[PDB]
Amino acid sequence: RFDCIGIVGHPHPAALATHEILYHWLKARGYAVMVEQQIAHDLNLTDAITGSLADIGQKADLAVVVGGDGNMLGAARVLARYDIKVIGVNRGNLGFLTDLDPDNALQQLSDVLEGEYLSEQRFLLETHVRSRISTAINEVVLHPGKVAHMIEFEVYIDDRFAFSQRSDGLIIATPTGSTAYSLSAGGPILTPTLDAIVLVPMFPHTLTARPLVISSSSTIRLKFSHITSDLEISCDSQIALPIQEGEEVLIRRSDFHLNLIHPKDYSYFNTLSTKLGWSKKLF
Amino acid sequence: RFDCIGIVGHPHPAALATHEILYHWLKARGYAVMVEQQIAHDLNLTDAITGSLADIGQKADLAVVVGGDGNMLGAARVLARYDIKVIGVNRGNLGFLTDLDPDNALQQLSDVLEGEYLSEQRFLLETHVRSRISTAINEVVLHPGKVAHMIEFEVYIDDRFAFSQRSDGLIIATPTGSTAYSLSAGGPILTPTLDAIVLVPMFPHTLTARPLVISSSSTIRLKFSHITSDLEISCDSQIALPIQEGEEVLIRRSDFHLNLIHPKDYSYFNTLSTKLGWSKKLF
């Protein structure tokens, strides 16, 4: 059972009803509820217990993230610092982190609160530049400032030299990231709980480049020759950290884990197929 | 240390010198040697202790597989049934299972016998059709008899329906297989010790198909609609097992493990780069 439920998200104005309905529903069912500060203000919830995201993350037992997969992205990176259960309500179709359909959210959530849920752990990525420490649920991306600019770098795996590369950047994706930016760059789908990390080059210079899937207990090091162009590292499409001259990037499995939960009737492959347009049962 | 070394392989006639040199060298260094029956005959080794591959596999402590990666393929599938160390001498360049270069084989092997080796385990695939039980080091491939013939099937992962497919077949590859047939079908490279298995469709009917990387502790089930065309399963390009009507294919991690060893100066990424034509150290 969950004593304290938190409502997270940042609502255009018609997404507000969802927050409003959920807050009253959760409340009338006897739960203590923490809403995010912005939503309390937006809905004028004078009685509501509010808090920042970190607050909810420390004091709530479950966070219902309302919104899309992108909303979930910033929310998840924080809530993963904590031992809180996270579940999401999407808007319309299923997403890879949001599996409560709005048409049936309450009913499904009602069963989840009863304790009918599938609990799993998504791992995050950690990045140092050398120390700035940033994290990512989907991917870390190395890339220059100019769009079509070829860079050179060497890739070390577990302290040992793996390979050089001439290209426009490298994408490093978690299983959760594999269906994201990495997919659109020609990378493979990894199953969500897999202990793996995929490296996908962007516009490689040689024709023999291919997505490399490595163990998630592996360490990655980026070394660079010289800097007259601006190297940058992005984590989940948040603000690029500049990479200075003589600096290296260190990417590894983070110690923070997203404690996702799902309703019993959830399955990954069904989410995947509906998302990608795969064939359903044929006979 | 290794008491009993076995020489395995099937030698065109100039590959015979290698077998001949190795057998005398191993012998003069004090080892008990088991040669394969064919090679004993081919070299006229009247004193040699011989045996089938299974024999060497049960009685030798190390098998030196002379030849190419293809020679290693049949040899490995058998030697993996046993707790024997396996190392290979290639012919020319490095391969993914053969890392002793002929130009330096003895010297490197001499250090290996001293106990200077990196030991690792490649897992195999197991297939039932329902029961015929066959195994594979590289991949299992579902495909019809006619070359360009579209088939329909459903794929179950861990007893649950994953997705349907219309295509010309499915490749299911181990990490060791990932650099093989699967690669040429547009699949990704998996790192050799990774607990993963990759599914790669062949000529899919829908544009949204993509290599799927799943956990190696996962089970796979192929179900089919009807049979007027001849379905077949191939394991490591050996003779196709026919798949009758009402029959399903079951593919899972086999319990047999290839106990490969490597010399200290071996590294996967160096083998990979030389094989694929990747850039070496740039600075």
Curated annotation (Swiss-Prot), chains A, B:
Marked site positions, Responsible for conferring strict specificity to NAD: 166
Active-site feature positions: 69 (proton acceptor)
Main subcellular localisation: cytoplasm
GO biological process: NAD metabolic process; NADP biosynthetic process
Reaction equations catalysed: NAD(+) + ATP = ADP + NADP(+) + H(+)
Record bears the keyword NADP: yes
Superkingdom of origin organism: Bacteria
One matching Pfam family: NAD_kinase_C
GO molecular-function terms, A-Z: ATP binding; metal ion binding; NAD binding; NAD+ kinase activity
Enzyme Commission numbers on file: 2.7.1.23
Swiss-Prot/TrEMBL keywords: ATP-binding, Cytoplasm, Kinase, NAD, NADP, Nucleotide-binding, Transferase
Cofactor (UniProt): a divalent metal cation
GO CC aspect terms: cytoplasm
Record-listed NAD(+) binding positions: 69-70, 138-139, 149, 166, 168, 176, 179-184, 238
Top EC class of this enzyme: transferase
Compartment(s): Cytoplasm
Tagged with keyword Transcription: no
Functional description taken from the UniProt entry: Involved in the regulation of the intracellular balance of NAD and NADP, and is a key enzyme in the biosynthesis of NADP. Catalyzes specifically the phosphorylation on 2'-hydroxyl of the adenosine moiety of NAD to yield NADP.
Assembly and interaction partners: Homodimer.
Family recorded in the similarity comment: Belongs to the NAD kinase family.
Name under which the protein is recorded: NAD kinase
Native source organism of the sequence: Yersinia pestis
